[PDB]
C-alpha cells in the first residue's frame, strides 16, 4: 500500500473519503474510493482554479481519486458559527469565491449539479473551494436542487449550480436551510410556497415540463424581506436573481460577479478551530 489512511473523513455522494499520507512522499491528501468515464475524469487533472479542489491523480483497478486535502467543510463551519452567525464580509468573500469557481468550470462546460455546504471546503487562509463534483455519469439531500431538475428536465444547465449556490447563500445569512424538503414533491412544494407556484408568465414552458401537474397547488409568492430578513437590499437583489425560476433568466456566475453586492468585497480570514 502506497497510502497510510489517516482517518475516514466521511462519505461523499459517490464513495468513501479518507485522509491519507503518501508513505514515500509525506504528502497529506484526500482519497475518494468509488465503486469512458475514465477519459473525461482524467481531463479534470490539469484544469485548475484557486476555488476548485485540485484533483491530483486517478487510479483504476474500483476507482480512486486523489485530491488535495482541506481541513474543514462549510457545513461544519456554519454549525460552529450558528450562535453568532458568519460575519457578512466573510459570507460575501465566500460567495464571491464560489462564483469565481463556478464561472471557471461553467466556462469549460463542466457542471457540478450537487452543490451543498458539505462539499464546500475551507482553509485557514480564507479560501473556499468547490469539491465533490457530480461527474460520475458525466439518504440524498434535496435541499439545494433546482426546480427544473425536480420537474424532470433531462437537459438542465449550468443554471442548476447558481440555484444551489443561492440556497447556500441564504443559509449562511439566516442560519437555517432555505428549502429543507424530505421528498422530491415536498422539496418542490417548499420552493413553491416561498417563491410562488411558477406559471407561464414567469417561466414559459413550465407547464410542459415532464413532471409538471396542472393539479399543483397555486401558492402566492412571498417577499424576500421575509425570506432572508437580515440581508441588505444588494444581497436580496442578487439572491432574487440567483433563484429565478426560468433557468434562462437566472443570473450567470460571470454576471453575478459584477453585481453591486460585491463592490466592497474583501477576503477576511475565518476563525477555524481544527
Ligand X SMILES: CC[C@H](CO)Nc1nc(NCc2ccccc2)c2ncn(C(C)C)c2n1
CB of 163: closest distance to ligand 7TW in angstroms?
Answer: 18
| Three-state SS at 214 | coil
- Dmax (CA) of the chain: 62
Annotated binding site: 9-17, 32, 68-70, 73, 116-119, 132
Instruction: Say which entry of ligand X, ligand 7TW, none residue 17 contacts (CB below 5 to 8 A, set by partner kind).
Output: ligand X
Instruction: Say which entry of ligand 7TW, ligand X, none residue 118 contacts (CB below 5 to 8 A, set by partner kind).
Output: ligand X
Point out the catalytic residue in the list 79, 114, 232, 234. 114
| Helices vs strands, H then E, count in the chain | 9, 8
CB of 32: closest distance to ligand X in angstroms?
Answer: 5
Residue 166: closest CA among 61, 236, 266: 236
Binding pattern for the stretch 55-94 against ligand 7TW, x by CB under 6 A and - elsewhere:
x---------x-----------------------------
Question: Among this protein's residues, is 211 annotated catalytic?
Answer: no
Contacts for 161 with CB less than 8 Å, ≥ 6 apart: 102, 106, 111, 112, 113, 115, 253
Specify whether the CB–CB gap between 40 and 31 falls below 8 A: no
Total of residues contacting ligand 7TW (CB under 6 A): 18
Cα–Cα distance, 207 to 176 (Å, whole number)? 31
For ligand X, the closer CB: 132 or 148 = 132
> What does the binding site for ligand X look like in residue numbers (CB under 6 A)?
9-10, 12, 17, 19, 30, 32, 53, 67, 69-73, 118-119, 121, 131-132
For ligand 7TW, the closer CB: 118 or 197 = 118
Instruction: Say which entry of ligand X, ligand 7TW, none residue 106 contacts (CB below 5 to 8 A, set by partner kind).
Output: none
Instruction: Say which entry of ligand X, ligand 7TW, none residue 138 contacts (CB below 5 to 8 A, set by partner kind).
Output: none
- The grid coordinates of residue 8 equal 475516514
Q: Which of 53, 122, 151, 243 binds ligand 7TW (CB under 6 A)?
A: 53
Sign of CA dihedral 117, 166, 100, 64: positive
CB atoms under 10 Å from CB of 84, counted, come to: 8
For ligand 7TW, the closer CB: 86 or 103 = 103
Angle at 103 between CA 232 and CA 165, to 5 degrees: 45
DSSP class per residue in 130-187: E-----S------TT--HHHHTT-TT--THHHHHHHHHHHHHHHHSS-S---SSHHHH
The catalytic site residues sit at 114
Q: Which residues contact ligand 7TW (rule: CB under 6 A)?
A: 14, 32, 41, 44, 47-48, 52-53, 55, 65, 105, 108, 110, 131-133, 135-136
Amino acid at each position: 500500500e502506497n497510502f497510510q489512511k489517516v482517518e475516514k473523513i466521511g462519505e461523499g455522494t459517490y464513495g468513501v473519503v479518507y485522509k491519507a499520507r503518501n508513505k514515500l512522499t509525506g504528502e497529506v491528501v484526500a482519497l475518494k474510493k468509488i465503486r469512458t468515464a475514465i477519459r473525461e475524469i482524467s481531463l479534470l487533472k490539469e484544469l485548475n482554479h484557486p476555488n476548485i479542489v485540485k484533483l491530483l491523480d486517478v487510479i483504476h483497478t474500483k476507482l480512486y481519486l486523489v485530491f488535495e486535502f482541506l481541513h474543514q467543510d462549510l457545513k461544519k463551519f456554519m454549525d460552529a458559527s450558528a450562535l453568532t452567525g458568519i460575519p457578512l464580509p466573510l459570507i460575501k468573500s465566500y460567495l464571491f469565491q464560489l462564483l469565481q469557481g463556478l464561472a471557471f468550470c461553467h466556462s469549460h462546460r463542466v457542471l457540478h449539479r450537487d452543490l451543498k455546504p458539505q462539499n464546500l471546503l475551507i482553509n485557514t487562509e480564507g479560501a473556499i473551494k468547490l469539491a465533490d463534483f457530480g461527474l460520475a455519469r458525466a439518504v440524498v439531500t434535496l435541499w439545494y436542487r433546482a426546480p427544473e431538475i425536480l420537474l424532470g428536465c433531462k437537459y438542465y444547465s449550468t443554471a442548476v449550480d447558481i440555484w444551489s449556490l443561492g440556497c447556500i447563500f441564504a443559509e449562511m445569512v439566516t442560519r437555517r436551510a432555505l428549502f429543507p424538503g424530505d421528498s422530491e414533491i415536498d422539496q418542490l412544494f417548499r420552493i413553491f410556497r416561498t417563491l410562488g407556484t411558477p406559471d407561464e408568465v414567469v417561466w414559459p414552458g413550465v407547464t410542459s415540463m415532464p413532471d409538471y401537474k396542472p393539479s399543483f397547488p397555486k401558492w402566492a409568492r412571498q417577499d424576500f424581506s421575509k425570506v432572508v430578513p437580515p440581508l441588505d437590499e444588494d444581497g436580496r437583489s442578487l439572491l432574487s436573481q440567483m433563484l429565478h425560476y426560468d433557468p434562462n433568466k437566472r443570473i450567470s456566475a460571470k454576471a453575478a460577479l459584477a453585481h453591486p453586492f460585491f463592490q466592497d468585497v474583501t477576503k477576511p480570514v475565518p476563525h477555524l478551530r481544527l
